[PDB]
Design a protein around this ligand. Structure first.
Ligand code: MTH
Ligand code: MTH
Lengths: 232, 234
């Protein structure tokens, strides 16, 4: 099997990239795809860049080109659920755009025409992720992750997300775009990210200071997840 | 005679007229998108129906570029008019595209800019000139300028006000142009947006859209046909 992995920033893909053996690099459409094996498992790691379009472009390339069996979106996120603290894990059971609005025509807030109002992550991928979380003794929350093309740091931006998606556990900028692409190609996906901040008026400083920590936690989780999917 | 022109429209109504005119037409269904190949007035074209929104347009544009390698991309369809002299049916030609809903300002990026990208994506000068030549020849009313995109249908109120305040110079607003420009930019492919006005993005936009979408589609499609011809023969 081939496992696809997508991270947005250098920090979020560098540790995994350093571990890929029989590594080959593909530079294309402004993205980088690293192919090879992670602890014996065939993977394809994509550094997509930040934002929905960058992520959609990279996911599309990855699916069309390398044709992985499942997609795992790694990286950092702004924590919204009460029990989350920096470094904690968020596992998507679903992804929705918090900034899409075509309600003028009767679509659900966050829903784009031609798409489900939310994209569901794969149950097996979620089960495997949670088994790893238990085995590594990590604090994690499973639930709705919302994406938009904006960095959230309190004020109006956070307020609007709370209103439309009070049950969202985390917010970031690529997951739902990746889920949307996977949905169109019928590819299972799961988002496994780590908290770099709590999306408030202090998230800039928190993100700056804890991104490396969040990237590491999510990377270790992905490493464990890949191994679990490949060997049980 | 060796040029392949890529054309991207989001909705059925926006691509149907051009599609019916493609000779030796074939249909490719990939990634939830539909691409029609063949010739338009003898010029090789690849017409994609992308679906609505930034991600749907990005996915489609990426497929079209990777799969059909067109030499240039023309984004067709409707838009909400923002510049004063625009009436329903008029043409808007992009000289630039920017996301009106992207905000990473907390980190010092320009409003609308995503990290790793230029704050705005510039349309091709030759494609712009050709489109304007077509405009002068069809004797249509048009405006050239900044087109801004977002994943929201602008219906007046705060959505509209925020846009006018952040991009006072924007001539129109829609939902796919900048995502297509972004993908084209990353692939180094020349692009131009030539859309037509279906509404003025105000509280009436919902009704105006339902009523004049066909008119915008007709006017934009005429422009695209003329542009394809212009680009291949002069
Ligand atoms: C530098 S923009 C923030 C990047 O980290 C993720 N991230 C982390 C925290 C966070 C937040 N509070 N709001 C939005 N995106 C966030 C996003 O997916 C994007 O790739
Ligand atoms: C049914 S969503 C609107 C569709 O038509 C375009 N459009 C036209 C007018 C308009 C507006 N006022 N606001 C946003 N998108 C608009 C968009 O790019 C999208 O494909």
């Amino acid at each position: 099997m081939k496992i696809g992995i997508i991270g947005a920033m250098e920090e979020e893909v560098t540790l995994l990239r350093d571990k890929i053996e029989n590594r080959q690099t593909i530079s294309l459409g402004g993205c980088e795809i690293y192919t090879g094996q992670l602890n014996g498992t065939e993977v394809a790691l994509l550094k997509s860049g930040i934002g929905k379009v960058a992520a959609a472009l990279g996911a599309t390339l990855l699916l069309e080109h390398c044709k992985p069996d499942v997609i795992i979106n790694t990286g950092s996120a702004g924590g919204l659920a009460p029990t989350l603290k920096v470094g904690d894990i968020v596992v998507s059971d679903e992804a929705r755009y918090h900034d899409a609005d075509v309600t003028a025509f009767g679509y659900e807030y966050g829903q784009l025409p031609g798409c489900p109002a939310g994209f569901k992550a794969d149950d097996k991928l979620i089960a495997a992720a949670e088994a790893c979380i238990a085995e590594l003794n990590l604090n994690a929350v499973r639930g709705l992750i919302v994406s938009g093309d904006a960095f959230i740091n309190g004020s109006v931006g956070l307020a609007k997300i709370r209103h439309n998606f009070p049950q969202a556990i985390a917010v970031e900028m690529e997951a739902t775009a990746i889920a949307h692409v996977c949905h169109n190609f019928n590819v299972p996906f799961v988002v496994v990210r780590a908290i770099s901040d709590v999306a408030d008026q202090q998230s800039h400083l928190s993100f700056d200071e804890f991104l490396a920590v969040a990237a590491k936690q999510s990377s270790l989780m992905v490493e464990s997840l890949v191994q679990k999917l490949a060997h049980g």
